[PDB]
Amino acid sequence: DLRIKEIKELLPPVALLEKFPATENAANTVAHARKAIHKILKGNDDRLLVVIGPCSIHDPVAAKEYATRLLALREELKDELEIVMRVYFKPRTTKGLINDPHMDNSFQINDGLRIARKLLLDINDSGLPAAGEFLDMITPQYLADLMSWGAIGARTTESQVHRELASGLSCPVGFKNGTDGTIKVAIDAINAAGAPHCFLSVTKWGHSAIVNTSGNGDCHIILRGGKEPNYSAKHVAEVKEGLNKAGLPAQVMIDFSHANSSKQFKKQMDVCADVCQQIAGGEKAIIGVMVESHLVEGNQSLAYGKSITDACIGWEDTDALLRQLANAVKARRG
Amino acid sequence: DLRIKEIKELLPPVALLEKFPATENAANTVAHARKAIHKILKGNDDRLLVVIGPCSIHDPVAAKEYATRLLALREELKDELEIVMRVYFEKPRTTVGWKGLINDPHMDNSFQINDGLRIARKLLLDINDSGLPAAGEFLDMITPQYLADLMSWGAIGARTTESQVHRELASGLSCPVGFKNGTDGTIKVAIDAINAAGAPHCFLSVTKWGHSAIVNTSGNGDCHIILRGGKEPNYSAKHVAEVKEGLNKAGLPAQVMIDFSHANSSKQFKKQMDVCADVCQQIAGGEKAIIGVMVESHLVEGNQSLESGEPLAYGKSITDACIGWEDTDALLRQLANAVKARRG
Amino acid sequence: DLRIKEIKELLPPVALLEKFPATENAANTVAHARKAIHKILKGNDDRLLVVIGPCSIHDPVAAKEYATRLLALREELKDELEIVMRVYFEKPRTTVGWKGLINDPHMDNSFQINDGLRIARKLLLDINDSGLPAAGEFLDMITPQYLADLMSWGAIGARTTESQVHRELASGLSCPVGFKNGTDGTIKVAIDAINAAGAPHCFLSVTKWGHSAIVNTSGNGDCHIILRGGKEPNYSAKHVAEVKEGLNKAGLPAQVMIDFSHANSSKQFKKQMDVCADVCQQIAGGEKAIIGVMVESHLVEGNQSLEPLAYGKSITDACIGWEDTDALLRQLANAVKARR
Amino acid sequence: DLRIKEIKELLPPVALLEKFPATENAANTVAHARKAIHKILKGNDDRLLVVIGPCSIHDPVAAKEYATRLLALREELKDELEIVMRVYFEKPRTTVGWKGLINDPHMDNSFQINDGLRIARKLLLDINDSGLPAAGEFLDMITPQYLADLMSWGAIGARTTESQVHRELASGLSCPVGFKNGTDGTIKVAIDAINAAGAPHCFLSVTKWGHSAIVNTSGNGDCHIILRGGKEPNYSAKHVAEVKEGLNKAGLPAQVMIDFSHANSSKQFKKQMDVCADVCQQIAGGEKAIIGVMVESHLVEGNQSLEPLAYGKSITDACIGWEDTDALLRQLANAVKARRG
Ligand SMILES: O=C(O)/C(C[C@@H](O)[C@H](O)[C@H](O)COP(=O)(O)O)=N/O
Ligand SMILES: O=C(O)/C(C[C@@H](O)[C@H](O)[C@H](O)COP(=O)(O)O)=N/O
């Protein structure tokens, strides 16, 4: 191992599960939210899953405020929406509160893991479900029990080892379309993750083992745009067709940011209007949306509660956007 | 965990390394081939790296018979070619299917992975001890520790070139690594991968004791692109030119390995010979940037399916279709002739 | 194999350390007690180390009441005694028997060892957090990692003073250690033990991650003998002088700790009061070699057998009750101020 | 941990079991030998168990030559003697000296314990594969995992016969276990240890994977005392009588193994033949409680201090040499024949 510089010890998942066990409150939040998203995916609930929050968590304090503001609207709009905080601990092409909690290249990953599990625990304990991005094959063991929904990143949707992981997660999973607008790799990923798999993974004890999964049927596509936005009713039509042709539920989640916002946080409100019109009009296929939002709109490379990663919408727009979606949902229902 | 049906004990890497230590000659094979490829990547040698052999290993008997034949050509053609055999134990599937010898050596969904690891490492050991270096695809995050000391070159497949955990893996590998262009032909994901892999990373991984740990890598500078086509093949001079400029633009060496198979053959195995003819004219006409090729070859041409029912023919691929030995011998001589012409 | 019926999962030390980390107070209590005991063993403190408490812990409830009472006397008699509570979570049996709180916290042969570990470390942590140092017997080769950071002093049982693995264990322990004389009163075994424990060793052990490893220790100087009688008691100033002679002959400090129980009490808890008088007579009369004493004390004197159990009474060896305990500590604190 | 200087990786047992797997020959040797000692310990065989071999192993080559010679005798005398080779790797020592083959295979204080474990297991494997059963000493709780599958009989250190942890270990051992009498000669501890060891236990151990776990044992019924002397030898008929007596009271089979060396020979290797003569008298006279003997034997008698060393000569305690060993074994066989008819 000439290219390995150092090897340092890592707390087994059991260490963090023992220090920060799920309270009865937290367990209930996870259970109910998973259950509620399953009902939506099976078409037995006309409500809309709303996964919304910062692009990346970098300050537990700002994150807990956001969680309290969001919890309020979650309880206010629960008849129309299943609201889940985005708590993302990040894929790049050149990387998180877990991988470097002190954001200083000290890579205090054990501390990062402690900070992240506590935050997720605290959010779930309040009654707010959480959502995460699963990029690593080892980290999920420390956090998955506090996750009600997760996303496989667009750069890993085609990866066999991430489809294996998805096939064994206890929460539903979204797969993003290709960095070009194509759905095939995401349809393939849903089909793969739906099947059982046998593969090597690290256990709660931190040792490697052979695991066998059952397959995950709570997997769905996420429309994130390509060279052009793909949230319009024309694109929704195409995706639904490609899903029926593949034998999958004609369901989609629409990501209002990234390629779909044209890379302009403000445009997420445009996507919202468009999407609300489709739902208000009777589009039952849109079962969920994803929105990058924070306390303060904008970005930075530190202001309190403002993103250090992608640019997000602020709280006022967030409140607005969330009521629009809840109103679109009543129109589709009554 | 409720979608986790069962958990089973897994031999740690140390137990495989102790049971199957590298011989002196196997370690010499690995060290010499890695150095030789480094020299080609450095432009300090005009030979061509040839990664050639089965799509997937499913039969140690046929693999060793194939290795003997390839070794004889490796020795005959070594002034021109650095021949490394494809010993691929891990297959990425488009959706589902047999994932290779390690995941399921009995090819019947018994998933006897401890046996698969023993079988795989013994075969790699035997092949290297004979003097033939080996190449593999690094797909799984945990299997590399069982095998990497016997690998002279590795590939990251097109479906994982964008994957951060695969780029992290390459930054700590002791062998040179090729990154495939994207399944749609995109070159940029591979240039980014090479740059990512050239840098040090700190990430979670598993040690030779089978325990997760925090690891720090130094970056791997022996990485390069593999052209494997997109919607259309991308082996022709026009494409090699675009890729050279893209690489230089990003501050990387302007050099490529060309996969004759997969989308560059439109998945028609005999078309590898057409790619070969075009690439040999490129090399013989003076193209120095083509430092390597990849070819899917076996003893018997074509392929067969485990789902057919028909008994398995010996020495015939059960994954992608491959050229047979006769075409393989003729292809290798074509490449060696072209490298010689490029030189004179 | 044939005589192994089942194997079950065991939390690694790092899981106990993370859930139940030392508070600053706990870290203080342990640090100072260790320093304090060190100063006594280097003969720079005239005080007496007193290792007193239940024979075994079986009830964090009764154990917590005791710790409050003892802590009061530790703070009052602190100028003469260094009080350290017995918190024994594991017990060596003569043949078989309940092995202590860790091995079987529910005293019913259910061997919920993971709960035992949790229960034991939370208690140890609270006792320390309150300011009361703690002592234990290090019997198991694997449990020490879960508890030793909360131990101010440790003991190697008489039936293991001669054990290589235990002598090795003592040489890497962060706390002072005492070796009980042989069960038949033999003093040599413990002198040898002290000497080994003081040297470095290289041996196999289990790390804080639950993994076996090769360990090198530095050797432990802060080790001493513990007199606990043999075929008859051996606490009398005659025996003490003989021991101080072997210790000198052997090159070691002529220092001793006296256990008023086990063989020195003929297994009769009340005779611990008798031994207290004899040793106080030696200490008031000038004996500067008695650096410590061990006493089996509990809330309610006597002992009971193992369904509902009587509060405050030992399920292992018989102990003196709290009444006798408070007088005993005042007897010792009186003998010390005399020597000074 | 402030008195902990360093921590180094240790190969897990599975790593050595994979590298050096029991052959079929080796497995049968262990199984058959373990079965034959059970029968002897159940009064169902009248043959004598003979654990004999070097005080400790420092040279696998000499050890293999010794094993070859003993194997021949083992076959020649099989109707009378169940001959098991002593394969011990260390001399437990209260003062410093060579730490044995596993601890320090290279005899230079380099503590190449990984090297030692490999050497030690490969030796036990080779010996068992040849057909010769092996006996070992269990001194710690971790090394047995790497070796016990090739052990047909085991002994607990005399300094740890009273230790609960070693009694727990014996309760899970797959081989019969001998327990040594106290150093002053008393048998109470070996009786307590037999009782303790015959009971099921639950305790923490390291597994084949090198991880700690909770284990439960069934208890070991094939345990017995080893007479190794006190202040005075304790092999004579008078002493056997006392021990048979105390065993019958404590509810245990009145049977013993007699260690001819150490205190029973006044630390004089040649006097193992004096003990042999006496024991052979007792046995040929009908004594049936003597189910076994332990002898320290090597190719070349005596010992040497650890530059080239003498081949086949102990570097720990002094042993009888091969000529005395062959004669001792024939003495034992001949007595066994007299006790029966
Ligand atoms: O080995 C290589 O160089 C590869 C991997 C390739 O062999 C893949 O595993 C099958 O083409 C998938 O086959 P399916 O599409 O049937 O899953 N290049 O892509
Ligand atoms: O705690 C101590 O200091 C000890 C241990 C002592 O408490 C022992 O555990 C019981 O006497 C066993 O009792 P039994 O003899 O019933 O197994 N000293 O010997």
PDB file of N, CA, C and O in Angstrom, chain B residues 53-78:
ATOM      1  N   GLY B  53      -8.316 -10.296 -22.508  1.00  0.00           N
ATOM      2  CA  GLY B  53      -8.714 -11.575 -21.958  1.00  0.00           C
ATOM      3  C   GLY B  53     -10.209 -11.609 -21.745  1.00  0.00           C
ATOM      4  O   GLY B  53     -10.942 -10.772 -22.271  1.00  0.00           O
ATOM      5  N   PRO B  54     -10.696 -12.571 -20.957  1.00  0.00           N
ATOM      6  CA  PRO B  54     -12.144 -12.769 -20.875  1.00  0.00           C
ATOM      7  C   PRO B  54     -12.880 -11.548 -20.329  1.00  0.00           C
ATOM      8  O   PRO B  54     -12.351 -10.765 -19.531  1.00  0.00           O
ATOM      9  N   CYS B  55     -14.120 -11.382 -20.801  1.00  0.00           N
ATOM     10  CA  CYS B  55     -15.025 -10.435 -20.167  1.00  0.00           C
ATOM     11  C   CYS B  55     -15.094 -10.672 -18.665  1.00  0.00           C
ATOM     12  O   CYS B  55     -14.935  -9.738 -17.867  1.00  0.00           O
ATOM     13  N   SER B  56     -15.329 -11.922 -18.266  1.00  0.00           N
ATOM     14  CA  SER B  56     -15.404 -12.313 -16.864  1.00  0.00           C
ATOM     15  C   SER B  56     -14.731 -13.665 -16.691  1.00  0.00           C
ATOM     16  O   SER B  56     -14.759 -14.491 -17.600  1.00  0.00           O
ATOM     17  N   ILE B  57     -14.112 -13.883 -15.536  1.00  0.00           N
ATOM     18  CA  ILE B  57     -13.573 -15.196 -15.186  1.00  0.00           C
ATOM     19  C   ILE B  57     -14.696 -16.002 -14.550  1.00  0.00           C
ATOM     20  O   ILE B  57     -15.282 -15.559 -13.560  1.00  0.00           O
ATOM     21  N   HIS B  58     -15.008 -17.182 -15.105  1.00  0.00           N
ATOM     22  CA  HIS B  58     -15.969 -18.068 -14.456  1.00  0.00           C
ATOM     23  C   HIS B  58     -15.428 -19.476 -14.251  1.00  0.00           C
ATOM     24  O   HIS B  58     -16.062 -20.259 -13.539  1.00  0.00           O
ATOM     25  N   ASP B  59     -14.240 -19.785 -14.788  1.00  0.00           N
ATOM     26  CA  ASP B  59     -13.698 -21.140 -14.778  1.00  0.00           C
ATOM     27  C   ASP B  59     -12.181 -21.042 -14.662  1.00  0.00           C
ATOM     28  O   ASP B  59     -11.493 -20.721 -15.642  1.00  0.00           O
ATOM     29  N   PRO B  60     -11.623 -21.298 -13.477  1.00  0.00           N
ATOM     30  CA  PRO B  60     -10.148 -21.295 -13.335  1.00  0.00           C
ATOM     31  C   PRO B  60      -9.415 -22.200 -14.319  1.00  0.00           C
ATOM     32  O   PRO B  60      -8.297 -21.864 -14.756  1.00  0.00           O
ATOM     33  N   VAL B  61     -10.024 -23.306 -14.746  1.00  0.00           N
ATOM     34  CA  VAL B  61      -9.341 -24.193 -15.687  1.00  0.00           C
ATOM     35  C   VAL B  61      -9.120 -23.475 -17.011  1.00  0.00           C
ATOM     36  O   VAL B  61      -7.985 -23.348 -17.487  1.00  0.00           O
ATOM     37  N   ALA B  62     -10.209 -22.985 -17.618  1.00  0.00           N
ATOM     38  CA  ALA B  62     -10.099 -22.239 -18.864  1.00  0.00           C
ATOM     39  C   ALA B  62      -9.269 -20.979 -18.683  1.00  0.00           C
ATOM     40  O   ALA B  62      -8.521 -20.589 -19.582  1.00  0.00           O
ATOM     41  N   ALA B  63      -9.386 -20.312 -17.534  1.00  0.00           N
ATOM     42  CA  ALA B  63      -8.591 -19.101 -17.360  1.00  0.00           C
ATOM     43  C   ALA B  63      -7.100 -19.419 -17.409  1.00  0.00           C
ATOM     44  O   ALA B  63      -6.319 -18.685 -18.023  1.00  0.00           O
ATOM     45  N   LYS B  64      -6.671 -20.526 -16.812  1.00  0.00           N
ATOM     46  CA  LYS B  64      -5.222 -20.865 -16.774  1.00  0.00           C
ATOM     47  C   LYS B  64      -4.760 -21.339 -18.164  1.00  0.00           C
ATOM     48  O   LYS B  64      -3.661 -20.982 -18.561  1.00  0.00           O
ATOM     49  N   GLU B  65      -5.605 -22.088 -18.872  1.00  0.00           N
ATOM     50  CA  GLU B  65      -5.246 -22.476 -20.259  1.00  0.00           C
ATOM     51  C   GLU B  65      -5.089 -21.202 -21.096  1.00  0.00           C
ATOM     52  O   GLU B  65      -4.106 -21.089 -21.816  1.00  0.00           O
ATOM     53  N   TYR B  66      -6.030 -20.271 -20.950  1.00  0.00           N
ATOM     54  CA  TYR B  66      -5.914 -19.010 -21.683  1.00  0.00           C
ATOM     55  C   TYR B  66      -4.647 -18.275 -21.273  1.00  0.00           C
ATOM     56  O   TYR B  66      -3.921 -17.740 -22.123  1.00  0.00           O
ATOM     57  N   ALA B  67      -4.357 -18.251 -19.967  1.00  0.00           N
ATOM     58  CA  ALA B  67      -3.166 -17.539 -19.498  1.00  0.00           C
ATOM     59  C   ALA B  67      -1.888 -18.123 -20.099  1.00  0.00           C
ATOM     60  O   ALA B  67      -0.971 -17.373 -20.454  1.00  0.00           O
ATOM     61  N   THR B  68      -1.795 -19.454 -20.208  1.00  0.00           N
ATOM     62  CA  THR B  68      -0.582 -20.049 -20.793  1.00  0.00           C
ATOM     63  C   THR B  68      -0.364 -19.554 -22.212  1.00  0.00           C
ATOM     64  O   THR B  68       0.755 -19.190 -22.590  1.00  0.00           O
ATOM     65  N   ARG B  69      -1.436 -19.535 -23.021  1.00  0.00           N
ATOM     66  CA  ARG B  69      -1.317 -19.106 -24.414  1.00  0.00           C
ATOM     67  C   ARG B  69      -0.947 -17.636 -24.514  1.00  0.00           C
ATOM     68  O   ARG B  69      -0.154 -17.238 -25.383  1.00  0.00           O
ATOM     69  N   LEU B  70      -1.573 -16.814 -23.689  1.00  0.00           N
ATOM     70  CA  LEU B  70      -1.282 -15.387 -23.701  1.00  0.00           C
ATOM     71  C   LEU B  70       0.139 -15.116 -23.213  1.00  0.00           C
ATOM     72  O   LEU B  70       0.819 -14.224 -23.728  1.00  0.00           O
ATOM     73  N   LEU B  71       0.594 -15.854 -22.205  1.00  0.00           N
ATOM     74  CA  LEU B  71       1.966 -15.669 -21.719  1.00  0.00           C
ATOM     75  C   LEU B  71       2.989 -15.910 -22.836  1.00  0.00           C
ATOM     76  O   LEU B  71       3.968 -15.161 -22.984  1.00  0.00           O
ATOM     77  N   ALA B  72       2.811 -16.984 -23.598  1.00  0.00           N
ATOM     78  CA  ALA B  72       3.705 -17.237 -24.737  1.00  0.00           C
ATOM     79  C   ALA B  72       3.741 -16.057 -25.711  1.00  0.00           C
ATOM     80  O   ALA B  72       4.802 -15.715 -26.254  1.00  0.00           O
ATOM     81  N   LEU B  73       2.588 -15.425 -25.968  1.00  0.00           N
ATOM     82  CA  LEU B  73       2.624 -14.264 -26.848  1.00  0.00           C
ATOM     83  C   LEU B  73       3.194 -13.061 -26.134  1.00  0.00           C
ATOM     84  O   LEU B  73       3.889 -12.243 -26.748  1.00  0.00           O
ATOM     85  N   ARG B  74       2.899 -12.921 -24.844  1.00  0.00           N
ATOM     86  CA  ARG B  74       3.513 -11.843 -24.078  1.00  0.00           C
ATOM     87  C   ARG B  74       5.030 -11.901 -24.209  1.00  0.00           C
ATOM     88  O   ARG B  74       5.688 -10.864 -24.367  1.00  0.00           O
ATOM     89  N   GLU B  75       5.600 -13.113 -24.168  1.00  0.00           N
ATOM     90  CA  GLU B  75       7.056 -13.248 -24.268  1.00  0.00           C
ATOM     91  C   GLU B  75       7.531 -12.962 -25.682  1.00  0.00           C
ATOM     92  O   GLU B  75       8.530 -12.270 -25.878  1.00  0.00           O
ATOM     93  N   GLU B  76       6.810 -13.457 -26.678  1.00  0.00           N
ATOM     94  CA  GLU B  76       7.247 -13.243 -28.044  1.00  0.00           C
ATOM     95  C   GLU B  76       7.150 -11.773 -28.444  1.00  0.00           C
ATOM     96  O   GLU B  76       8.009 -11.277 -29.178  1.00  0.00           O
ATOM     97  N   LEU B  77       6.126 -11.054 -27.978  1.00  0.00           N
ATOM     98  CA  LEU B  77       5.832  -9.729 -28.511  1.00  0.00           C
ATOM     99  C   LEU B  77       6.256  -8.612 -27.569  1.00  0.00           C
ATOM    100  O   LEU B  77       5.918  -7.451 -27.796  1.00  0.00           O
ATOM    101  N   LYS B  78       7.023  -8.934 -26.532  1.00  0.00           N
ATOM    102  CA  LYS B  78       7.310  -7.985 -25.458  1.00  0.00           C
ATOM    103  C   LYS B  78       8.139  -6.776 -25.872  1.00  0.00           C
ATOM    104  O   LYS B  78       8.120  -5.769 -25.161  1.00  0.00           O
TER     105      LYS B  78
END
